[PDB]
Design a protein around this ligand. Sequence first.
Ligand code: CAC
Ligand code: CAC
Length: 319
Amino acid sequence: QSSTVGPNVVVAADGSGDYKTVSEAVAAAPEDSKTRYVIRIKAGVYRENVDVPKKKKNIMFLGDGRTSTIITASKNVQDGSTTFNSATVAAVGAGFLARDITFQNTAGAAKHQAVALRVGSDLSAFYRCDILAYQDSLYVHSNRQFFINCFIAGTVDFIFGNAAVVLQDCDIHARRPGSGQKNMVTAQGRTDPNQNTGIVIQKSRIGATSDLQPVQSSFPTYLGRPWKEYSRTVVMQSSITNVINPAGWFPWDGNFALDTLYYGEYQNTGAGAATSGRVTWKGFKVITSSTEAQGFTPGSFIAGGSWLKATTFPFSLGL
Ligand SMILES: C[As](C)(=O)[O-]
Ligand SMILES: C[As](C)(=O)[O-]
Protein backbone atom coordinates (compact mmCIF):
# COMPACT_ATOMS: atom_id res chain seq x y z
CA GLN A 1 0.00 0.00 0.00
CA SER A 2 3.13 2.45 -0.14
CA SER A 3 6.44 2.85 -1.95
CA THR A 4 9.68 4.09 -0.33
CA VAL A 5 12.67 2.83 -2.35
CA GLY A 6 11.38 2.15 -5.88
CA PRO A 7 9.91 -1.45 -5.89
CA ASN A 8 10.01 -3.49 -9.12
CA VAL A 9 8.01 -6.48 -7.83
CA VAL A 10 6.20 -7.88 -4.75
CA VAL A 11 6.70 -11.30 -3.07
CA ALA A 12 4.06 -12.61 -0.62
CA ALA A 13 3.65 -16.03 1.00
CA ASP A 14 -0.09 -15.38 1.53
CA GLY A 15 -0.71 -15.03 -2.22
CA SER A 16 -1.60 -11.33 -2.26
CA GLY A 17 1.43 -10.28 -4.30
CA ASP A 18 3.02 -10.94 -7.70
CA TYR A 19 4.85 -14.21 -6.80
CA LYS A 20 4.81 -16.60 -3.81
CA THR A 21 8.57 -17.23 -3.50
CA VAL A 22 11.73 -15.10 -3.32
CA SER A 23 13.45 -17.25 -5.96
CA GLU A 24 10.80 -16.30 -8.55
CA ALA A 25 11.53 -12.57 -8.08
CA VAL A 26 15.29 -13.02 -8.57
CA ALA A 27 14.63 -14.99 -11.78
CA ALA A 28 12.52 -12.12 -13.16
CA ALA A 29 15.27 -9.50 -12.79
CA PRO A 30 17.19 -8.66 -16.00
CA GLU A 31 20.98 -9.19 -16.27
CA ASP A 32 23.72 -6.54 -16.59
CA SER A 33 21.51 -3.70 -15.28
CA LYS A 34 22.93 -0.26 -14.50
CA THR A 35 19.98 0.64 -12.27
CA ARG A 36 18.76 -0.99 -9.05
CA TYR A 37 16.04 -3.70 -9.06
CA VAL A 38 14.07 -3.75 -5.78
CA ILE A 39 12.19 -6.78 -4.41
CA ARG A 40 9.64 -6.16 -1.65
CA ILE A 41 9.11 -9.23 0.55
CA LYS A 42 6.00 -9.30 2.78
CA ALA A 43 5.66 -10.93 6.22
CA GLY A 44 5.86 -14.73 6.37
CA VAL A 45 8.18 -17.77 6.46
CA TYR A 46 9.90 -18.85 3.21
CA ARG A 47 11.30 -22.41 3.08
CA GLU A 48 13.76 -22.25 0.16
CA ASN A 49 17.44 -21.87 -0.78
CA VAL A 50 18.06 -18.68 -2.81
CA ASP A 51 20.90 -17.88 -5.24
CA VAL A 52 21.80 -14.47 -6.75
CA PRO A 53 24.42 -15.27 -9.47
CA LYS A 54 27.23 -13.16 -10.99
CA LYS A 55 25.19 -11.69 -13.87
CA LYS A 56 22.36 -10.42 -11.62
CA LYS A 57 23.86 -7.13 -10.41
CA ASN A 58 22.44 -4.35 -8.21
CA ILE A 59 19.61 -6.42 -6.66
CA MET A 60 17.96 -5.31 -3.37
CA PHE A 61 15.88 -7.31 -0.84
CA LEU A 62 13.41 -5.12 1.10
CA GLY A 63 11.52 -6.98 3.84
CA ASP A 64 8.68 -5.81 6.08
CA GLY A 65 10.64 -6.36 9.30
CA ARG A 66 13.54 -8.37 10.73
CA THR A 67 11.17 -10.08 13.20
CA SER A 68 8.45 -11.06 10.71
CA THR A 69 10.14 -11.85 7.36
CA ILE A 70 12.14 -15.13 7.46
CA ILE A 71 14.07 -17.12 4.77
CA THR A 72 14.97 -20.60 6.11
CA ALA A 73 16.58 -23.99 5.21
CA SER A 74 18.87 -26.69 6.74
CA LYS A 75 21.60 -28.00 4.38
CA ASN A 76 24.74 -29.23 6.19
CA VAL A 77 28.06 -31.11 5.93
CA GLN A 78 27.14 -33.98 8.27
CA ASP A 79 24.38 -34.95 5.82
CA GLY A 80 26.40 -34.64 2.61
CA SER A 81 26.69 -31.02 1.42
CA THR A 82 29.92 -28.99 1.14
CA THR A 83 30.45 -25.89 3.32
CA PHE A 84 30.20 -23.60 0.27
CA ASN A 85 26.95 -25.20 -0.99
CA SER A 86 25.19 -25.32 2.42
CA ALA A 87 24.14 -21.64 2.45
CA THR A 88 20.43 -20.81 2.81
CA VAL A 89 21.03 -17.59 0.83
CA ALA A 90 24.02 -16.95 -1.47
CA ALA A 91 24.64 -13.42 -2.78
CA VAL A 92 27.28 -13.23 -5.54
CA GLY A 93 26.21 -10.63 -8.13
CA ALA A 94 27.93 -7.26 -7.58
CA GLY A 95 26.20 -4.51 -5.59
CA PHE A 96 23.77 -6.62 -3.52
CA LEU A 97 21.72 -4.87 -0.77
CA ALA A 98 19.30 -6.11 1.94
CA ARG A 99 17.31 -4.63 4.88
CA ASP A 100 14.65 -5.59 7.48
CA ILE A 101 14.83 -9.40 7.04
CA THR A 102 16.17 -12.67 8.59
CA PHE A 103 18.48 -15.32 7.02
CA GLN A 104 18.67 -18.60 9.02
CA ASN A 105 19.90 -22.24 8.92
CA THR A 106 18.19 -24.67 11.35
CA ALA A 107 20.47 -27.74 11.08
CA GLY A 108 21.78 -27.51 14.66
CA ALA A 109 25.07 -27.95 16.51
CA ALA A 110 25.32 -31.71 15.88
CA LYS A 111 25.34 -31.24 12.07
CA HIS A 112 28.65 -29.33 11.86
CA GLN A 113 29.13 -26.72 9.09
CA ALA A 114 25.76 -25.21 8.06
CA VAL A 115 25.74 -21.68 6.59
CA ALA A 116 22.92 -19.11 6.88
CA LEU A 117 24.34 -16.41 4.54
CA ARG A 118 27.30 -16.51 2.09
CA VAL A 119 28.46 -13.28 0.41
CA GLY A 120 30.82 -12.88 -2.58
CA SER A 121 29.44 -9.58 -3.93
CA ASP A 122 31.73 -6.52 -4.27
CA LEU A 123 30.29 -3.30 -2.76
CA SER A 124 27.41 -5.03 -0.91
CA ALA A 125 25.65 -3.82 2.28
CA PHE A 126 23.20 -5.05 4.95
CA TYR A 127 21.02 -2.97 7.34
CA ARG A 128 18.78 -4.22 10.19
CA CYS A 129 19.12 -7.91 9.24
CA ASP A 130 19.36 -10.96 11.54
CA ILE A 131 21.72 -13.85 10.59
CA LEU A 132 21.16 -16.97 12.75
CA ALA A 133 22.80 -20.44 12.95
CA TYR A 134 25.44 -22.48 14.86
CA GLN A 135 28.77 -23.52 13.22
CA ASP A 136 29.76 -21.23 10.29
CA SER A 137 26.73 -18.87 10.42
CA LEU A 138 28.14 -16.02 8.25
CA TYR A 139 30.50 -16.81 5.33
CA VAL A 140 32.13 -13.50 4.33
CA HIS A 141 33.75 -15.25 1.35
CA SER A 142 35.22 -12.52 -0.90
CA ASN A 143 35.32 -8.85 -2.01
CA ARG A 144 34.24 -5.62 -0.16
CA GLN A 145 31.30 -5.71 2.34
CA PHE A 146 29.54 -3.53 5.02
CA PHE A 147 27.13 -4.55 7.86
CA ILE A 148 25.29 -1.89 9.96
CA ASN A 149 22.89 -2.38 12.90
CA CYS A 150 22.65 -6.14 12.26
CA PHE A 151 22.36 -9.04 14.77
CA ILE A 152 24.60 -12.11 14.23
CA ALA A 153 24.51 -15.31 16.35
CA GLY A 154 26.48 -18.59 16.26
CA THR A 155 29.00 -20.93 17.96
CA VAL A 156 32.11 -22.34 16.19
CA ASP A 157 33.85 -19.98 13.68
CA PHE A 158 30.59 -18.10 13.01
CA ILE A 159 32.06 -15.15 11.02
CA PHE A 160 34.65 -16.58 8.56
CA GLY A 161 36.25 -16.21 5.11
CA ASN A 162 38.57 -13.91 3.12
CA ALA A 163 36.57 -10.77 2.27
CA ALA A 164 37.42 -7.17 3.27
CA VAL A 165 34.57 -6.42 5.70
CA VAL A 166 33.57 -3.96 8.44
CA LEU A 167 30.70 -4.61 10.88
CA GLN A 168 29.64 -1.29 12.50
CA ASP A 169 27.17 -0.71 15.39
CA CYS A 170 26.17 -4.40 15.39
CA ASP A 171 25.10 -6.90 18.08
CA ILE A 172 27.18 -10.11 18.05
CA HIS A 173 26.19 -12.95 20.44
CA ALA A 174 27.60 -16.44 21.03
CA ARG A 175 25.04 -19.15 21.93
CA ARG A 176 25.17 -22.48 23.80
CA PRO A 177 26.96 -25.19 21.74
CA GLY A 178 27.22 -28.97 22.02
CA SER A 179 28.85 -30.86 24.88
CA GLY A 180 32.61 -30.28 25.01
CA GLN A 181 32.70 -27.59 22.30
CA LYS A 182 34.40 -24.17 22.41
CA ASN A 183 33.02 -21.06 20.64
CA MET A 184 35.10 -18.86 18.27
CA VAL A 185 33.61 -15.54 17.04
CA THR A 186 35.91 -15.26 13.97
CA ALA A 187 38.10 -17.39 11.65
CA GLN A 188 39.80 -15.08 9.10
CA GLY A 189 41.53 -16.72 6.13
CA ARG A 190 44.10 -14.42 4.47
CA THR A 191 46.85 -16.54 2.82
CA ASP A 192 49.23 -13.86 1.45
CA PRO A 193 50.62 -10.61 2.98
CA ASN A 194 49.78 -8.62 -0.16
CA GLN A 195 46.04 -9.46 -0.08
CA ASN A 196 43.95 -6.49 1.11
CA THR A 197 41.53 -8.51 3.27
CA GLY A 198 40.40 -8.91 6.90
CA ILE A 199 37.55 -8.74 9.47
CA VAL A 200 36.88 -5.50 11.43
CA ILE A 201 34.38 -5.08 14.31
CA GLN A 202 33.81 -1.37 15.20
CA LYS A 203 31.60 0.38 17.78
CA SER A 204 29.66 -2.86 18.38
CA ARG A 205 28.38 -4.98 21.29
CA ILE A 206 29.79 -8.51 21.91
CA GLY A 207 27.97 -10.76 24.42
CA ALA A 208 26.02 -13.97 25.13
CA THR A 209 22.48 -15.24 24.43
CA SER A 210 20.09 -16.13 27.26
CA ASP A 211 20.86 -19.86 27.06
CA LEU A 212 24.64 -19.38 27.32
CA GLN A 213 25.01 -16.66 30.00
CA PRO A 214 24.20 -18.92 33.01
CA VAL A 215 26.79 -21.54 31.96
CA GLN A 216 29.63 -19.51 30.42
CA SER A 217 31.99 -21.32 32.81
CA SER A 218 31.22 -24.61 31.03
CA PHE A 219 31.60 -23.46 27.40
CA PRO A 220 34.64 -21.16 26.76
CA THR A 221 34.35 -18.43 24.08
CA TYR A 222 37.19 -16.61 22.24
CA LEU A 223 37.36 -13.71 19.74
CA GLY A 224 38.97 -15.98 17.10
CA ARG A 225 41.55 -18.52 15.81
CA PRO A 226 43.91 -18.37 12.73
CA TRP A 227 42.44 -20.48 9.90
CA LYS A 228 45.16 -19.34 7.47
CA GLU A 229 48.81 -18.19 7.75
CA TYR A 230 48.21 -14.42 7.49
CA SER A 231 44.90 -14.13 9.39
CA ARG A 232 43.94 -10.48 10.14
CA THR A 233 41.18 -9.39 12.57
CA VAL A 234 40.55 -6.16 14.55
CA VAL A 235 38.11 -5.28 17.38
CA MET A 236 37.85 -1.56 18.26
CA GLN A 237 35.68 1.00 20.10
CA SER A 238 33.37 -1.84 21.24
CA SER A 239 31.82 -3.15 24.48
CA ILE A 240 32.67 -6.75 25.46
CA THR A 241 31.06 -8.78 28.30
CA ASN A 242 32.86 -11.44 30.38
CA VAL A 243 31.75 -14.09 27.86
CA ILE A 244 35.28 -13.79 26.39
CA ASN A 245 38.02 -15.79 28.19
CA PRO A 246 40.95 -13.59 29.42
CA ALA A 247 43.36 -15.19 26.91
CA GLY A 248 41.32 -13.49 24.17
CA TRP A 249 42.42 -15.63 21.21
CA PHE A 250 42.91 -19.40 20.53
CA PRO A 251 45.54 -21.41 18.53
CA TRP A 252 44.68 -23.28 15.30
CA ASP A 253 47.34 -26.01 15.30
CA GLY A 254 50.35 -25.52 17.56
CA ASN A 255 52.61 -22.64 16.51
CA PHE A 256 50.93 -22.29 13.09
CA ALA A 257 50.59 -18.62 12.06
CA LEU A 258 51.43 -17.16 15.49
CA ASP A 259 54.36 -15.09 14.17
CA THR A 260 52.70 -13.82 10.97
CA LEU A 261 49.06 -13.08 11.91
CA TYR A 262 47.80 -9.62 12.98
CA TYR A 263 45.16 -9.53 15.75
CA GLY A 264 44.63 -6.07 17.27
CA GLU A 265 42.49 -4.30 19.90
CA TYR A 266 41.87 -0.50 20.28
CA GLN A 267 39.95 1.36 23.05
CA ASN A 268 37.30 -1.26 23.93
CA THR A 269 35.26 -1.30 27.18
CA GLY A 270 33.56 -3.87 29.43
CA ALA A 271 34.63 -6.74 31.69
CA GLY A 272 35.88 -8.74 28.71
CA ALA A 273 38.01 -5.89 27.33
CA ALA A 274 40.86 -6.27 29.86
CA THR A 275 44.17 -7.02 28.12
CA SER A 276 46.45 -7.92 31.05
CA GLY A 277 45.88 -11.67 30.63
CA ARG A 278 46.01 -12.03 26.83
CA VAL A 279 48.16 -14.48 24.81
CA THR A 280 51.89 -13.71 24.36
CA TRP A 281 52.08 -14.22 20.55
CA LYS A 282 54.25 -11.92 18.40
CA GLY A 283 51.22 -11.26 16.19
CA PHE A 284 48.91 -10.03 18.98
CA LYS A 285 48.93 -6.32 19.75
CA VAL A 286 47.29 -3.63 21.89
CA ILE A 287 46.95 -0.63 19.54
CA THR A 288 47.65 2.76 21.15
CA SER A 289 48.00 4.93 18.00
CA SER A 290 44.92 6.53 16.40
CA THR A 291 46.46 6.66 12.90
CA GLU A 292 46.96 2.87 13.01
CA ALA A 293 43.35 2.30 14.11
CA GLN A 294 41.90 4.70 11.51
CA GLY A 295 43.28 2.51 8.72
CA PHE A 296 40.61 -0.07 9.53
CA THR A 297 37.62 2.33 9.32
CA PRO A 298 35.18 2.22 6.32
CA GLY A 299 36.61 5.20 4.44
CA SER A 300 40.13 3.76 4.50
CA PHE A 301 39.58 -0.04 4.50
CA ILE A 302 36.74 -0.50 1.97
CA ALA A 303 36.72 2.79 -0.01
CA GLY A 304 33.45 3.81 1.67
CA GLY A 305 33.38 7.40 0.44
CA SER A 306 32.78 6.13 -3.09
CA TRP A 307 29.66 4.00 -2.52
CA LEU A 308 28.07 3.94 0.96
CA LYS A 309 25.90 7.01 0.35
CA ALA A 310 24.24 5.33 -2.64
CA THR A 311 23.14 2.31 -0.55
CA THR A 312 20.38 4.43 1.07
CA PHE A 313 21.53 3.15 4.51
CA PRO A 314 23.22 4.99 7.46
CA PHE A 315 27.04 5.03 7.88
CA SER A 316 30.15 6.61 9.45
CA LEU A 317 33.48 6.81 7.56
CA GLY A 318 36.08 7.35 10.31
CA LEU A 319 36.71 7.04 14.06
C1 CAC B 1 -4.74 -4.38 -3.30
AS1 CAC B 1 -2.95 -4.77 -2.80
C2 CAC B 1 -1.85 -5.10 -4.33
O1 CAC B 1 -2.30 -3.55 -1.94
O2 CAC B 1 -2.91 -6.09 -1.84
C1 CAC C 1 37.22 -25.27 9.00
AS1 CAC C 1 35.81 -23.99 9.15
C2 CAC C 1 36.48 -22.21 9.10
O1 CAC C 1 34.75 -24.23 7.95
O2 CAC C 1 35.00 -24.25 10.55
